[PDB]
C-alpha cells in the first residue's frame, strides 16, 4: 500500500490490511457510540418517596372520609412527592473488544485514504510556540479544520495549537476514531504512520 507525501512528493509503504480495508460501518458506529458513552459523566439523582423530606403519617384515615385512600404525603402522585423510578448515578461505559476497536480504526483510516482526507508529511514543526506561526503554516497547507498527529512531544506545537478550535494536536498513541471522523483533514507524521502500523499490525 503506498501513500504519496504532500511536501516532498515521495512514497511511503504501508500495510494494505491497515490502510486499504473495506469500510465496516456497523463496527465503526459501534465504536463511536461506545466512545461517546464513555465520555458520559452520569452524575444525576432524583429523590424517591423514601428520600423526600417528610413524615410517614397517613394524611387522613383510611375510610369514613369522602376522599381517596392515601398512605403517604411522599407519594409520587402528589405535588412535591417522590419520583417513581428516581435515577441513580450510573456508569454508561460500554465494553469494546480490542479487535473491534482496531478493526474500526483500520476501517476509518482506509476510508480517509479513499476520501483523500489523509495527509502525510515527513515532519510538521513550528519553531516558536506561536499560534500565528501555526496559522500561517496551515494557511500555506490550505488547512483549517485539522487533526495533527505527531509521534513525538512537541510543546511549542501543542501551545501554538491550543487556542485554535479548528485544530487539534495529538500524539500517535492518543488518537481516537471520533476525532479522526470529526476533523476534516488528518496530518500524519511518517513516523506516526510507522507507530500506528506497529500498534495495529
Amino acid at each position: 500500500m503506498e501513500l504519496v507525501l504532500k511536501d516532498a512528493q515521495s512514497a511511503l509503504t504501508v500495510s494494505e490490511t491497515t490502510f486499504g480495508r473495506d469500510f465496516n460501518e456497523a463496527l465503526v458506529h459501534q465504536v463511536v457510540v461506545a466512545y461517546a458513552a464513555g465520555a458520559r459523566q452520569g452524575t444525576r439523582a432524583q429523590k424517591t418517596r423514601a428520600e423526600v423530606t417528610g413524615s410517614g403519617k397517613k394524611p387522613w384515615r383510611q375510610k369514613g372520609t369522602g376522599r381517596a385512600r392515601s398512605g403517604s404525603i411522599k407519594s409520587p402522585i402528589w405535588r412535591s412527592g417522590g419520583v417513581t423510578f428516581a435515577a441513580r448515578p450510573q456508569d454508561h461505559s460500554q465494553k469494546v473488544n480490542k479487535k473491534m476497536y482496531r478493526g474500526a480504526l483500520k476501517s476509518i483510516l482506509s476510508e480517509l485514504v479513499r476520501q483523500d482526507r489523509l495527509i502525510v508529511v515527513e515532519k510538521f514543526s513550528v519553531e516558536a510556540p506561536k499560534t500565528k506561526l501555526l496559522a500561517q503554516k496551515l494557511k500555506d497547507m490550505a488547512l483549517e479544520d485539522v487533526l495533527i498527529i505527531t509521534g513525538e512531544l512537541d510543546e511549542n506545537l501543542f501551545l501554538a495549537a491550543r487556542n485554535l478550535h479548528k485544530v487539534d494536536v495529538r500524539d500517535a498513541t492518543g488518537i481516537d476514531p471520533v476525532s479522526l471522523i470529526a476533523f476534516d483533514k488528518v496530518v500524519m507524521t511518517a513516523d506516526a504512520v510507522k507507530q500506528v502500523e506497529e500498534m495495529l499490525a
Partner: peptide, 27 residues
C-alpha cells in the same frame, strides 16, 4: 389574607359525627 385552614385536613369529617342514623335494620 393569611386565609388558610379551609380544606387542610377537612377536620369537617375528622369530626366523623356519629353516623348509622339508627338503621341497623339492614342486618
Amino acid at each position: 389574607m393569611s386565609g388558610k385552614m379551609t380544606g387542610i385536613v377537612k377536620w369537617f369529617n375528622a369530626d366523623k359525627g356519629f353516623g348509622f342514623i339508627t338503621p341497623d335494620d339492614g342486618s
